[PDB]
Amino acid sequence: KVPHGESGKVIGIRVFSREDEDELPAGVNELVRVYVAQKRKISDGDKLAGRHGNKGVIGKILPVEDMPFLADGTPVDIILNTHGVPRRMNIGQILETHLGWCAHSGWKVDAAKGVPDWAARLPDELLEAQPNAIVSTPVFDGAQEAELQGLLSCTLPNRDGDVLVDADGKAMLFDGRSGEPFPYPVTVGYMYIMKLHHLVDDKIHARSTGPYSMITQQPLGGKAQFGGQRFGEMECWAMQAYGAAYTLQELLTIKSDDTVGRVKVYEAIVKGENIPEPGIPESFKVLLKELQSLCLNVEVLS
């Protein structure tokens, strides 16, 4: 059976058999393998990242109409916070954003009367580029700040002779949600972001009741079986510090391993009665039997 929390098309089936003299592990007659495929879109809680260590999960996915848009009506795709950049010392992402805008729009250094000084040691056939040009800045020998500034000062218009991003590299955005323009220019450009293999659809899990263990009667663990979340020692200290004795007593008895308490509380809930009183956990009795198996006379007095 396909386990918990899985679905998708069946794309392939690979069936082996002893009748066709296939090499199988000894004692095996047949072996069949089924492939199930899913197509996953990006969603809130999925993890994205750049090449400079600027990770973060997706907080919201806005409709395309309520997003900051350029003067020509172009919405932005992603919005990053300002407070994360200067404190982490990864200013390379800002320079990548500037050079990405320059590469997207395409430039032309005007050597009308002599090449500009900032473009003196710039390699040839970099004095002009077409829109959507691919460039490269080697790791320790790339684009200087003066060259980036010069390239930003000379960058091609889009369709009509309108330059959307000025020499500082910032644009005047409109608030797509209210309508008014933002009072100060904002930094815009093109950044290369990656989708990391930390998606929410593999991370979400919940359980009311389900399978239990065998030796000790506590719930299992893991999403594929069902399992419950672990309430460890530190979480017990926290509840003792709060002073909540009843919450702690129920969590450890009638939610984990009080074998009659579980059924009684389920019945009480569905029938609308009062939740009953907990009994004795089964792990304590397992402990007593192990201690007796070690030849220790453990006895409970009254």
Binding site: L95, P185, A206, T247, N274
Partner: protein, 718 residues
Amino acid sequence: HQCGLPKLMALELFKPFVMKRLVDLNHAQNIKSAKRMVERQRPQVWDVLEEVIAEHPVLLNRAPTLHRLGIQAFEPMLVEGKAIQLHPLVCEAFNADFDGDQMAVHLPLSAEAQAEARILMLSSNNILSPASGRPLAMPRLDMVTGLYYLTTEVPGDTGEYQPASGDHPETGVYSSPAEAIMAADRGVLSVRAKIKVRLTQLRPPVEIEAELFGHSGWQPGDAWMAETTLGRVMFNELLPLGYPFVNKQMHKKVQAAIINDLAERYPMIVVAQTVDKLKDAGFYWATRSGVTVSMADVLVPPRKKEILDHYEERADKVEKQFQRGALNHDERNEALVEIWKEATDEVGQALREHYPDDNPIITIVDSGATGNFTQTRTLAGMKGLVTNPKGEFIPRPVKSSFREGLTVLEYFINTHGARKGLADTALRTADSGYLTRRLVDVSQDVIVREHDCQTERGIVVELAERAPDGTLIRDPYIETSAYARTLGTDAVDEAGNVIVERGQDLGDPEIDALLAAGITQVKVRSVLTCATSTGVCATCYGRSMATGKLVDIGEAVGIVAAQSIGEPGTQLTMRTDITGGLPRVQELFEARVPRGKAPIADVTGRVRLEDGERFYKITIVPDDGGEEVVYDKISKRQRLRVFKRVLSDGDHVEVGQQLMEGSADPHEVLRVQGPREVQIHLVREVQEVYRAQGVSIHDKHIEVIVRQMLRRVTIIDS
């Protein structure tokens, strides 16, 4: 008090509760039909679910649960998606950033488990830290930037107040804050321009209320004239109605002061609502503050090259002196290090003086939102000296900023220390937890049992020692040693009547009164001297740092103390043979012999010192004259102690004066000076580390642990 719970998770947690209501509403014949409905998710299960989950608390938890506020109870509401939505103002308590964290959800079932999650663990009932009493639900980051932008007065802005010129009357005066909000919508006025407004719904400050209304006060409705900016009127509309008018720029310190004042003088619901309104305004105005990062905003100091050349000449002269044999290897390194430290400071000062006040980077730094100025110097002006794998400075130093870009060698020598820093954290994350686990076990049997043991014993507190020329300079660390305590004796000064009676909470007003009256020492109650048989009492413990009132008669103070001591680990950097960090704390609590043991005196008198070869030799001359104490094997690699001048031959020493420089072992000080002295020693020594790391822990927690350390006695004669 709310959280966002994805509806497929909520439908699974609340399955039994929805199955009952489906049958109760005649949407299902029996429980099997309702179960099939819930499993197949028919459209009415949602209408039943939103009704079922109403006012049913849910417990949210993030691991590791270092302290009490790692679990809090919220009121669930359904959201679209698969991610739990968390309020921005609980991340400091949870220590939860949004780079991929996860939290677990639990669901109370019985009536007591549900009342304990609404009256005890609800998020809005826990605003103050139990370790120190400081609020934890304050605005931070984007909210601080937005609130700092709003309450700022820009000189010569749009619509400013203009005095009469003789041809036209005054300009910039408004008849209400609703006429100013209408002028700001026309572009005629700026939210940060100085204006004069006629306020009627905002309480005037103390002086203006005294000099205009007298009588009793403003009595909402009475109009007064304020000279302020629009942003400050907007900010003060977010505060309670009876709170005076705060005409100031909202640096993070000012916000902390305001929220402490409100928490002291108002109930909890008022503070929770106020912080919510402040969150809303802070986000709204941080979106409009214009804080972005472009390399045109990262200015460089105008004369970095002159400074670097000037100090390069100094370094060259030092190197030439070394090359001529004037000094050994270490002296040259020390000289170069001093030169380059001076150069780094002189670059940083020029950088500080070059930036404007409205630059986004210095704005974020100076509003208190986040970051310090060393990070701004490293990014704009110059990195500077870097360390070895051993820890000694590289004398080069790194001379480029991250705006210019480091070269290959500079990047390499910088990675040297970067990786050391990362490994330090990676390895302390486990030691903190082990220490917390041991502290929780030692002190799990300290619970408030009585209300008053009615003892007369107590400890004394320094409380602003007297100045030399004559003045009471307050002791800097008075909030963690004298506040939230109850007096054991009465405070009488200069034959004056009792300034403060026995058994008083001893808060800010009482401390101010005692300092004005002119006393320096008070005997207060402490858990070290509680006379109850099992557990402490309430008056000896004192105020509860989280509630603000006297502790209850069931509170488990031992676990709170352990979690308060052991939670701020992690953010406790190990420091470069005397231990100075988490190892120092661990050896203090484990009562081990210190690594750098330094002998202490045993009896007063003068001391004769023989500077032997390969080890010192100190002997104490007893004033009594019975026997002389000799300390033979003391390495010359240590130092002599300085108290008040370095230890000089024939100098007088006290009964417990520490001779060498280092750490005295707690066992000898107990054998010589008794239990009170070792209690003082231990509390002071632990607080010294925590203060050095800038962490505020009240002394009563360390006192709980130390009390647990001194319960037994040793048998010498049966």
